[PDB]
Structures are given as structure tokens and as C-alpha cells.
């Protein structure tokens, strides 16, 4: 994963270089001085890459060698139990329907329908969250 | 009162040629569909609308 | 609270634009809110007592 | 019918109300000062301003339409709360 | 198995996308700020310094309590986790009421969304932050409800941690915005 | 022996075997299939839109269409093509092959995939539903400049639906890219190394990186635009610098919106070359370096759409664009050197690839010609740039998409498409496309700027439009043979059960059964190079492969 | 113009090229082998087919024939 | 109906000629402490009644309890639905405002006068002459207070008595059979839950009545023949008749000095809809040739044909109802009125077969999924690496297991089965704390073991018996 | 011997490849004809609830012995009817199963054999097999 961190920090360095060069070149030789619009975007995308690389480095600096990170490893080294995966389910289509309703409401100005869409969004999120935690009925 | 500009696209229904008077027509109000009064008139489109069933 | 709001609330019509009433419009909503909350709390207590005892 | 509609009078101001009546805009019947008295315009604008700007003494308003939104509200709120309470009280088996 | 956690990287990239959303918002705000000379804020506007700092202190205290909840979280204790999360939720609710009161005060004295450009950009910048704070409160409620309905697993701890540094990111962007607005001016 | 087998597999299967499975799905493969179907349908809608266009444009004068309808018409055509076909087809190929390419049993977030798919479908349905409005949909072009998109002009409901559809599609794309990044980074084969995966994975992950970099800015921009349209927030008023600001941000978002739709299909052609060339990929690490260089610099060249405004610094962005031109040439050189001195066999996929490189070559020449500021000062907004982006976009996307479909159809369905109909389709599409989109240079450099509803008989070019219409009509009917072939071969046609119908395959994909069961795996071979299935099927060729790996 | 003498080009140009390509390509030979002839010996290896529809060595009959 | 002057308290309505009943309604709404609240509660409760009866009829139709033992109950229910719908139609007409006046005028006058043979006789008998009569409103008031409510109450009592004597059905389950009933006794549970539900329904009615304004007659005006506007679309439980009137094409017949108008077809359609509702069980029993008793219902996914016909009917009703709301559709959403009318007209014919086929396929797919989950263990959502290189689902068997570890196939008994691991007891019941402080470990362990023992004992008693 | 392109995997499954320009069936029969015979076979097997198999190889030995030896390869030999045709030696045979007895098996072999033989002199074999399978399926009654 160290390769991914190196790539991310290279991207961060490139973004920082581009941002600082654009800022210094727009300070002078400009009709309107500082552009003040693209400079912010470049600066914060560089900051994004910086924080992502920092998080990856913090993860890398406190982790052991995984079989995929070790070339020449054998298949039985990775043998074990993987994470949990959701089988057949249907909540996401209902969540998407609620989101579409909310989008339609915020399209044409009808506050009642946007409130209904927000309520449906909350209900769909609640249904999604509890799909794998509700136990047997207490009866 | 119809606009005197056109006065040329009227039809003068077969038995009521002389009923009209210049810029006057004097149509009734009770719609023949169900009896709902129709009071929705557009001057530019010359269309009368019945609100009960469009 | 419902008893108090029924006894001592201004319910005579004064709605206009010369004076900001902001209260005459709040008689029926207050009545309904108090009534529904009271009896709904009673029902919730009853069902919880049944389901846990 | 066929496209154009009737706008809401909520964003209307009285001078423009009188002027719009007297002008006869698109799809609207033009009104002359001869057929309607000036006192009639004053009364009309007074009623228009009173009706919309007065607080409804029946709680939250539902758009001023007929009972179709009322039925929609019944189906979306009363039904949902009722079936939720039924499921809470009842059991599934 | 699974030395890293996919939820961690997913939340990291999601917060990255939201950080670029706030980048766009900052781009909207900083634009046209220099277009007005001298007193570029409209006179019918005066920020209340005596009320803005307390909500910032509220949010940083909530973030510290959330970190304490995390420290309780990596070990086997759910009840202290719930206590810390409830404290953070109450602190954030007090904050939210704070900017609601500030909102009520501001519009009552002139400046509104359609009034001036500065008012519009400030309102737009603060509204998304308020909405995201409310979403964070909703996430707190959902997560705390999920804790008490079943057994404790590392997935619950992962969800708590990701929500925690999402809140920390919210705190960081809020303090950055506050420094931009009330100090640099 | 004498194993008992059916004469044919089930044609359609048992009744009711698709609906509920589609609704309650969790499989990435069928999600990609639905992506492909939706892309094909939207491609059809936009294609009939464009045919109506080209039949109206010919025969100078207004025959049967009005100006505002024409304006709404190119708004919808451009929007549908740019943001409802290519972006979903990217995630379609993602869901089809990326978990299969890496070897992962499943995606990271199966729920999120269906969430994104349904969100995109709903957003497309809402946005495209602007034709039912009596006032119609939005009238401004897909550029959506500052002053025409406010409340004062275009006050119809179409703009709101357009904006909300774009918002929903962007959110779905963001979630899909997040899913792809998480799946690639977290899950992998146990013996798998990041320096051994096919180039398509590198292209898709840099593409997702660019997605996450670019898309949220559009969300903020459209939120601000909706706020202006519904509340009058004075954000984009002419009294302020919003005219430049909105253009800057929108182009900064949209130029990566076309750079994202090139790398994955470059990877597709890169992985389709070796199987027919019987040679290893050329400049592997060099290809990765060039992909990274394209991905990084694909974001700092946005201002080269501002030449006509005359308020930005020219030479810096000109130099940046001329720098970004080189890595595309490096990719092309790698591709052409891959197939040099090989046993190339002419089938439908490589013929589509040949057409792809031809069209992309011509488009790249036009683009590198376009980069000159003084040249753009005369040729901008003319049909020249129209031919430019038509060439590049169509030649990459349509050709590579059809080639990849022809390639991986047996992997998804276990059936092989006919080659005669494929050859006829390729020839007819190629002929129509170079016939209808060649002359617009001649029409464009002379006075005839884009998006015109009419012109005058006094000017010439009364026959060039006729030739363009003839070619466009020819291209319109070229899709029908492909549809008939696909529909016939879905149930009927040759059935392949032996692995890798196209022998000498690579990319680890040809080591499993042609009809892939759930979780996609029952065995795993050794991982020693970037051609594991090739070594597995021909173990006696390893020594030779390792011996002459650096002859040059 | 809407004249038929010039609409003839727009109508017939695609059809003639479609016909030419069809007679050039479709008239060629597919990879499907020809039908087995009874006079020709059964050079194909032995083959059996099973319905495999019902889901769940002793012999109780027989037959013979010589055409 | 004698004309009077208001001269009350509502200033914008002073000095206007008006009907006495409208004045009394205004008095109830404005000059009595809380009268508006009570009338709003009444109207909201009537809508509650209509929606509840519709939902109950739908559930009865889906469960298929309308077989031989209880056919007369179905006929009585159809009569109840028709009478309640007519009573509800008569409800909103007593305060004769513009909306109610227009609705009653249109419906009653046009339909009654449009009768081919009798026609004018019925209208003149009902109104006492022309349409606007001095006796119409008192007659409607009397019919709304006395005849229909009493008949409805008596018939409801009859239906309750019939369902009391003939024992209620039950869903299939572990300890359920066609010769016994599983449930709870009256004293400790049944009556208490009924009272709690009654209190809760009164609560929701009161809350939503106090929050939502309904039928603001004061905003309207007194009924006059010359006033009319877009105000239309009466109460939503007879709205289908209005939609049918709207969408019907204008076909007419002209023979010797006579004319039959279009709405006669609407009358024929509504009469046939009335006729078909009680006649359905006879048609089913003489079509399928089944004459067997049944005390056990069938889950909806088991019978495809009946579910398909139900989807047919509900889709037809929904498309007809939404057609009548055309004006609001074109207003809130900028759509052409004519386009929406044409859409409804064409959809009334083209939509039904599509949804019929779709729901048939849906039911078949549900049956297939149930068979599949019967064949193998329910999916646990866990995969294993299998160092030799495979991936397995690790199904959790629901019962007997063979020598190979693959559970032997079970049999379908029409009983629901869990589709998620958390539905069955796997890992639950966390610590004994309330919300912030845990309890003693011994108490939590004792509670856990007691609950497990109680649930196991209940399950064993139900399964064995 | 693991033909080039086929390699044994870790498990018992065999992974095999083929040159792109060739097929993987090599059946000298029309596609539509094979589809029709498969449809007839399926729609007869579902009704009769008895497995039916067709063999087109050579039986240059005791035809009855070879035919009864082949029947063991049926997934359910106890309930199955096998029809074998040897075009080189003109051998047509039909055999029964243990469970499929007394269900019209005896009253079906002569009719099906006669139909197939009569349909084999005009040069076609597939329609003859279809006719034989149809007539024997009609003869076979469930039980
Ligand atoms: C898939 C979509 C796509 C792709 C791949 C491209 C690829 C390129 N584009 Fe294009 N472009 C668009 C879609 C695309 N474009 C769209 C939609 C617009 C405007 C939309 C609107 O405004 O309406 C646009 C507008 C546009 C403009 C401004 C036009 C205008 O606003 O007036 C310019 C000029 O700077 C430009 C240049 C390029 C260049 C240099 C490339 C290069 O990537 C391609 C060059 C590739 C080559 C093959 C060269 C490879 C190198 C060699 C082979 C070595 C030798 C080369 C040299 C001679 C140096 N594009
Ligand atoms: C991927 C993107 C993409 C694709 C694939 C296409 C495909 C085509 N385009 Fe389009 N086009 C654009 C993107 C694309 N276009 C963009 C971005 C612009 C300008 C943006 C702007 O200026 O706003 C543009 C503009 C544009 C114009 C000029 C518009 C203007 O200046 O006014 C023209 C006409 O000259 C044209 C023609 C075509 C043709 C003939 C095809 C053909 O390739 C299409 C062939 C397809 C078919 C025709 C389908 C077959 C149709 C039927 C047979 C359906 C019948 C069946 C049913 C009844 C269900 N395009
Ligand atoms: S009375 Fe005219 S539409 Fe009904």
C-alpha cells in the first residue's frame, strides 16, 4: 500500500507546485490581479491529496505486511475468513426513489413535497441502517 | 365583444345567420355537457372553457 | 393544560391586517395538539404496560 | 387549457393589480373603467389584500385547493401512523 | 484478516469530496470580495463577535469529548461510549440553536438573502455547514441506537471511529471558515 | 466417459427469472449489464434527436421546426451524450470486469452499486422529462453561460429539471467512483502485487481519482445556480465578476469531464491488442508513467476554453496543453509498437480498434492544430471544433465500447456473436462516419458558426450539408444490424464452454468458467507476471518469455 | 428542396451500398459445417444427448432394427 | 334555503344574500367555542372511515377469505361499501357552498336527467320540480342523519355478529391446522389491546384534525347559479366517477325526436362496477370448479391469477382517480391539460395489461425464490478463502443435514421463512444497562438464560402441539 | 493427454482453450434443426417425467449388449428410455429402465422403431428421431 501512498504524495506535490506557480504568476502580469477562483480549488485539492497521503502513511506506519504486499506469497497464506457481505436486498432502490422525489421537489418550488421527500429520505436511511441488526420479534 | 379587426373567420351557424349583431354574440352559459356553468373565456384564443370537466 | 387552554384562551374573532393577532389562529391547533398528545400518551402507557408486564 | 395558466395573486401588489385589470394582458379579459366603477376597483383590491394576507383560523393551510390534497394527506399521514401503531400493538406470525 | 478497513478509506475519500464541496463554497465567497472597496461589508451589517466565539468553543469541546469517546471505544466499554456521544450530541444541539438564534437576529436588522451580495454569500456558506452538522447529529442518533440493539463487534467500533473523524473534519472546516470570516474580514 | 450434455442450453430460461432478481440484486455483473442497456437506450434517443437535427439543417430555411425547439434540441442532445451515456458506460465496464480483472470475489459495497445505478436511472428520467412542458426544457446549450441561465432569461421549468438531473447523476457518479476506489485499494488477490495488474485497472483508478477531484465542484456550482434562480442571490450578476467566475469553475469541472472518458478505453484497447498480436504489452511501466502524467496534468489546462474572452494569461495554458499532448503520443507509440512484427488476424474487435486509432489520430491532429491562440481567434465556435470533439469522442467511445462488447460477450453470457454481421456493421459505421464528418472543416473555417437554425441562400455550402445529411442517415441505420445480431445471439448462436474463446488471452480473466458462477472463482493459479492465464495454458513457454524480455 | 428528383439520392444512396455490402459479405461462407450425409460414414465421434429435465443399469426390454 | 342576510361577525361577508344553512355552518365554525375543531374532526374521521374500509376490503380480497364459508359476509361488505360511499357523498353537501352546490348539481342533475327511459320522473321526484328546490336540503339532511346511519349501524352489527359466530381464519404456521385456532384469550390481552388502539386512533384523529385545515367554507361563497371556477374534484372516495365522466369520449345517438347523452355510459359503467363486486365469489367458484371448505388462508405470492386480477383492478382505480386531478397536475407541474387528458385516456386502456403481466411475472419470481431458499440453506453473507482457491457461501441449514453436509431438501407448507440471519436468534440481547449505566453481571446473565429458556419452551410447546 | 490448451487445475475441473476462429461443438447439423429437436425432447420429457437419451454412435458388436451397457451413463438409469442409432450398420434400438415399466413401454418400442425406420429411408435422420420420440412419448403414460 506504500506504493499508493507514494503516488498520492506525488499527486499532492504536483498540485502544490501548480497552485503556487499559478498564484505567483497571477499576482503580477494580470489585468485583474489575483484570480482568487482557481487558486482556491488548486490549493484545496492539493490539501486533499496531502491529508489522504498522511492518513495512508499513518495507516502504513502502524500495520503489518499483508500477503498481497509481499511478492512471492502463496495462496494458503491468505486463507481465512473475509468480511461480511450483504446478500440479496432491495432497500437501495427505495432510497434512490426517495432521493429522486426530493430532487424533483427541490427542482420546482413546492415546500410540502420537499418536506415529504426529506421524510422519505430519513425513513429509507433508517431502513438501510437496521437491515442487519433487528433481531427476532419479541411477540 | 369580439375584436372588430378580424370579423371574417366566423361561421354564422346554418339557422342563425342574422342572430349576431356586429361585435356582439350573446352566448348562453349552461354547458351542454353536464350543466356546469362555464365562465372561462380567453380573448386571444377565442376559446370558452368549462371548469368542471375541461 | 387542555382544560386551562379551553377555559382561558381568546377565541373571539379579531383577525385582520390592522393588528397582528398571531393568537386567534392558534386556538384550534392548540386544542387538537393538547387532546391528541394527552390521549396518545395514555395509549402509549397502556400498550407499554401490556407489553412489559 | 393548452399551456398558459392563472398565476397566484400572493406576489401581487395593489397598484399593479388595478393597472393589470385596466390593461388587459395576455389571455386576460380587458376591463374598462366605464363598465366597472372606481369604488368597485377599491373594493376588489381591498378584498384581495384581506383574503390572502389574513391568517387562516384553521391551523396549517393546504394550498387553498379542494379535497384532493386533503385525501393525499390522509393517505400519507393517517394511514402511515395508523399502520405503524397497528404493527406496534400487534404481532407478526 | 483485513489488516486495513475499507470503511476507513471510503469515509476518507467521502470527506475529501465534501472538502472539495466546501472548496467550491469558498470559491463562491472569496469571489467579488475584492470587487467592493473600503467597507466591503454593507453598513446594515455588523457581526456579533461576542456570540460567534462561544459556538466555536462549543464545537471544539464537542470534538474533544468525541475523541474521549473514541478512546473509550477502542476498548471494551459501550456505556462510556454512549455517555460521551450523548454529551457530544447535546453540545452540537446547543451549537445548532446558537446559529439559529444568530440567524434570527441577523435578518431582523436588515440584511437578508435577496438584500446584498455579502449577505447572500455568507448565508450560502453557513447554510451547508449547518445542514452537514444536522446530518452529523442524525448519524450520532442512528449509531447510538444501533449500539444498544445487538452485540458488540469491530464493525461498530469502525462506524464510531469514522463518524468521529467526520465530526473532526467538520470542526476543522468550521474553524477555518470562522477564521476566514470573523478575523481576516 | 461419454458424458451426457444438452444439445442446447436454455434459450430464455424459466418464466419470471429476471424481474425480482433485478429488483433485489447484489451482483455487479448484472448491474453492469443494466448500465450497458441504459446506455444503449439513451444512445438511441440521442441518435434519433441528431437525425432529426441533420434532416432539419439541410434544405436551407425553416421547413417544419422552430428556433426554440431547435435550441432545446441541441441542449438535450449534448446533455444526453455527454452526461448520460459515457459516464454510465464507464461504471458498466467497471462492474463487468474490474472485480473479475483483479480477482476479487466481490465488490466492496454491493449495496452502493445498486444505489448509484438506480440514482442515475432516476436522475436521467427526471432530467429527460422536460419535453412534456408546454414551454419545453432548457433552451441554453450545454455550455450554460452566466447571464442566460439566471431567472431573468429562460424562466421555464426545464432548466430546473436539467440542473437536478445533472446533480443526481453527479452524486451517483461520485458514489460509484468511491466504490471503485475502495474495491481496488482494499481487496486484491493474495499473491497479487500492484506492479503486476493490467493497465485497465490503473486507468480506471486514475479515472476515479479524477472523478473525486472534479465532480463536487459541479454540485456546488449547480446549488448556487439554483439558489440564484429561485431566490435572487446576486451570485452571477453582471455587476460582479460572476461572468468570469462561473465560466472558470464550469470549465474547470467540464474539461476533466472529457478527460475522464478517454483513459479507461485506452486501457481497453491496450488489453485487446495483445490477444490478437500474440505479444506482450509494450512499455508497461512507461505506460503506467504516462497514465499518471496524463491524470495529474489533466486538471491544470482548463483555461484554454477562454481564448475568445481575452481575460486570461495565454502562454502558460498554451504551454500546459502542448505538454499534455505528449503523453497521448507516448500511449499511441506504445500501442503501435506492441503490434509491430506480429501475427495479426483480422476479426471484428481488432478492426474496430483499427478504426479507433484512425479516428483518434485524425481527432488528435485536429486538436493539436486547435491549441494555437491566434488560430482559435478565427476558428473558435465554428464547425472545426465541432468536428474536433466529434472525431475524438466518437472514435474512442463508440468503437472501443463495441470492441469490448464483442470481446467480453462470451465472458458474460457464454455465447459468441457472429463475425459477418460484425464486419458489415463495422464497415458501414466507418463509411458513414468518415463520409458525414469530413467536410465540416471546409464548412467550418469559412463563416458558419455552430448552433444555427438557418442561413441564407446567398451563401454557398448548399451541398456540403446535403452530403453530411446523407452520411448521417447512412450512420443512423447502421446500428440495426448490431441490434439484430445481439438479440439473435443472446438466445441462439454459437455456445462456448471452453475457457478463453479468443485463445492466447491475458489479464488473469481466462482462468475461470465462461459462465461465471457467484463469487466468480473456484480455483486460483500462481501469479508471477502480468500474463498468468497465458503462462498457465502454455507452461512450456515460460523460459522463452523470461529469456527474451529485453531484446528491444 | 422537397423535390422528388433530388430526394431520390437521399432515399436510394444508402440502399444501394447496403445491397452491395450484403452481396459481398453475407454471400460468403460461414464456419458452420454442412449437414451430415447418410452415404458419408459417421466420421464424427460418438455423441449422446440428455434432456436433463426431471430432478431426483437394470434392463427390462429391448429392440432391434436394420432400416 | 330561504334567503337571509349574514350581519354576523365575518366582516368580508357582511350584507350578502345567502342561504340559512350556510349561515348556520358559519355560526358553528366561528361563533361557538371550538365548533370548527369538532366539525374538522368529523370530516377527517369520515375520510379515515373511507380509507380504512378500502384498505380492509383490499386485504380481504388479497387473503382470499371470501370462499364458501363466508360468501354472505362478502356480499354484506359490498353493500356496506356502497352505502358508506353514498353517505359520504351526501356528507359534504349540506353546507351548500359553491363546491358542494356545483358537485351535487352536476352529478345528480346530469345523471338523473340523463336516464334514457324514466329520466325526468326521478329528478322531479327527488327535487320536487326543477333542480333548485326548497325541499332538497332538508331531505338530504334527514337522509344523512337518520336512514343511512341507522342502516349502516345495523348492517355493521350483523357483520360483526357473523364474524363472531363463524370463527376467524388464521395464517399457516407451525402449530396451525384446519381444525383449530391459535391465538390469545380475551380477558388479559384482547380487550386491552382494542382499547389502547381505540385511544391511539382517537389521538391521531385529534392531532391531525387540529393541525390540518379542511373545507374552509368561509373562504368560499354562498351558492348561486352564476358563480363557478376551477373548484372541482370532490372527496377522493367517489373521485373515480368524476374521472370516468372526464375521460369518456363524446359519443351520442340521435333517432326520432330523442337523444341519449354521453353520461349514460358512465351510469352503465358504475352500475356494472356495483354489480361485479358481490358477484365475484360466484364467478370464481363456478369458474375454477372448487367447492371445498377452507379455514386457512394463502399467502399472496402463492396464487398468481387472483393477485394479477387484484393488480388489474387497483391499477385501473388508481389511473382513473389520478385522471380527475388533471388540473392540479397541469398547475403544479407545467404540463399541457390536453396532453394529460390524452395520457389518461390512452393509459386507461394500455396500462392495465402491462401491470397485469408484470405482477404475474413478479408472483412467479417470488415462488421461484421461495423454492430456491427451500432447496438450500439461507445465505449467511460470509465467504471463505478455501486455500485451494475457492469461495463458498457457507449456507446455514434449517434442519436435517445429510452425510455430505448439504442439507436435505425440505417441503413447502405455505409458511413464511426468514430470509436474513438476524431474523433468527444468532447474536442479540446486549448488556442489562438502561441507557448509560450497566447492571450487575449476574443479573444480566440470569435475564439472558431466563429469556432463552422461555423462548425455547414456547417454541417447543408450539411445535410439539 | 491434456490436449494443448487443456490443463488440469488444483481441483478436478479442467480448463481448456481454443483457437479464436473455431467453434467448440463441431456438430454437422443445422442450428434451427438442433434447437427444434431439443425443444421436442424437453417438452416430451416434462410431460412423460421420464428421461430420454439419443445416441448416434456406432455399435459394431452385439447391439443389445452395447446398448444396455451405455444406459449406465444415464444420470437416472432406473427411469430412462434410450434410443440409439448407428448410421454405419443401420442399427436402431430402444431400451427400457427398471422404474419405467408397465407405463406403455412395451406398446411404444415397435411403433417408435417403425416410425424412425420409415423416416430414415428418405435421407433425413433428425426428423425421424423427432417423430419416434413424439410417438413414444404419446405412448408412454405417467405412473
Ligand atoms: C473525448 C472528448 C475530447 C478529447 C479526447 C479531446 C482532446 C483534445 N482536445 Fe478537445 N474539446 C472537447 C472534447 C475532447 N477534446 C469538447 C467537448 C470541447 C468544447 C466543448 C464546447 O465548448 O462546446 C473541446 C474543446 C477544445 C479546445 C478549445 C475549443 C474552443 O473552445 O474553441 C481545444 C484547444 O485548446 C482542444 C484541444 C484538445 C487537444 C490538444 C486534445 C488532445 O488530447 C488530443 C491530441 C492527441 C494527439 C493524437 C497528439 C498525440 C501526439 C502526437 C501524435 C505527437 C505529435 C503531435 C503533435 C503534432 C505535437 N479541445
Ligand atoms: C458521445 C457523444 C456524441 C455522439 C455519439 C453523437 C452522435 C451523432 N451526432 Fe452529435 N453532438 C455531440 C455529441 C455526440 N454526438 C455534442 C457534444 C454536440 C455539440 C454540443 C453543443 O454544441 O451543445 C453535438 C452536436 C451535433 C450536431 C450539430 C448541432 C448543432 O451545431 O446545432 C450534429 C449535426 O450536424 C450532430 C450529429 C450527430 C450524428 C449524425 C451522430 C451519429 O453518430 C448518431 C447515430 C445514431 C443513431 C441515429 C441512432 C439511430 C436512431 C434511430 C434509428 C432511432 C429509431 C428507433 C426508435 C424509434 C426507438 N451532433
Ligand atoms: S357541464 Fe361543461 S364540461 Fe361538464
Swiss-Prot record, chain D:
Domain Cytochrome c per the UniProt entry, residue ranges: 1-52
Ranges annotated as spanning the membrane: 71-91
Localisation: Cell membrane
Processing after translation: Binds 2 heme c groups covalently per subunit.
Additional information: Was identified as a high-confidence drug target.
Function: Cytochrome b subunit of the cytochrome bc1 complex, an essential component of the respiratory electron transport chain required for ATP synthesis. The bc1 complex catalyzes the oxidation of ubiquinol and the reduction of cytochrome c in the respiratory chain. The bc1 complex operates through a Q-cycle mechanism that couples electron transfer to generation of the proton gradient that drives ATP synthesis.
Assembly and interaction partners: The cytochrome bc1 complex is composed of a cytochrome b (QcrB), the Rieske iron-sulfur protein (QcrA) and a diheme cytochrome c (QcrC) subunit.
Descriptive protein name: Cytochrome bc1 complex cytochrome c subunit
The species this protein was found in: Mycobacterium tuberculosis (strain ATCC 25618 / H37Rv)
Shown chain mapped onto the complete sequence: 188 to 280 of 280
UniProtKB/Swiss-Prot annotation, chain E:
Example GO biological process: aerobic respiration
Pfam families hit by this protein: COX3
Enzyme superclass (EC): translocase
Reactions catalysed: 4 Fe(II)-[cytochrome c] + O2 + 8 H(+)(in) = 4 Fe(III)-[cytochrome c] + 2 H2O + 4 H(+)(out)
One of the record's GO molecular function terms: cytochrome-c oxidase activity
Keyword Nucleotide-binding appears in the UniProt entry: no
Origin superkingdom: Bacteria
Predominant location category: membrane
Keyword set includes Metal-binding: no
Stretches that traverse the bilayer: 12-32, 53-73, 78-98, 125-145, 161-181
Its EC number(s): 7.1.1.9
Membrane topology note: Multi-pass membrane protein
Keyword terms: Acetylation, Cell membrane, Membrane, Translocase, Transmembrane, Transmembrane helix
Cellular component GO terms held in the UniProt record: plasma membrane
Subcellular location: Cell membrane
Family per record: Belongs to the cytochrome c oxidase subunit 3 family.
Record's protein name: Probable cytochrome c oxidase subunit 3
Species the sequence originates in: Mycobacterium tuberculosis (strain ATCC 25618 / H37Rv)
Gene: ctaE
Curated annotation (Swiss-Prot), chain F:
Keywords: Acetylation, Cell membrane, Copper, Electron transport, Heme, Iron, Membrane, Metal-binding, Respiratory chain, Translocase, Transmembrane, Transmembrane helix, Transport
Record flagged with keyword Cell membrane: yes
Cellular localization per UniProt: Cell membrane
Pfam families according to UniProt: COX1 (PF00115)
Residues annotated as transmembrane: 31-51, 80-100, 112-132, 161-181, 204-224, 249-269, 281-301, 306-326, 350-370, 389-409, 424-444, 467-487
Domain of life, source organism: Bacteria
Catalytic activity: 4 Fe(II)-[cytochrome c] + O2 + 8 H(+)(in) = 4 Fe(III)-[cytochrome c] + 2 H2O + 4 H(+)(out)
Binding site for Fe(II)-heme a: 77, 390
Membrane topology: Multi-pass membrane protein
Example GO biological process: aerobic respiration
GO cellular component: plasma membrane
Record: residues binding Cu cation: 255, 259, 304-305
Pathway: Energy metabolism; oxidative phosphorylation
EC code: 7.1.1.9
Cross-link 1'-histidyl-3'-tyrosine (His-Tyr) per UniProt, renumbered positions: 255-259
Residues the entry annotates as binding heme a3: 388
Keyword DNA damage included in the entry's annotation: no
One Gene Ontology molecular-function label: metal ion binding
Function as written in the Swiss-Prot or TrEMBL entry: Cytochrome c oxidase is the component of the respiratory chain that catalyzes the reduction of oxygen to water. Subunits 1-3 form the functional core of the enzyme complex. CO I is the catalytic subunit of the enzyme. Electrons originating in cytochrome c are transferred via the copper A center of subunit 2 and heme A of subunit 1 to the bimetallic center formed by heme A3 and copper B.
Entry's family note: Belongs to the heme-copper respiratory oxidase family.
Full protein name: Probable cytochrome c oxidase subunit 1
Gene name tied to this protein: ctaD
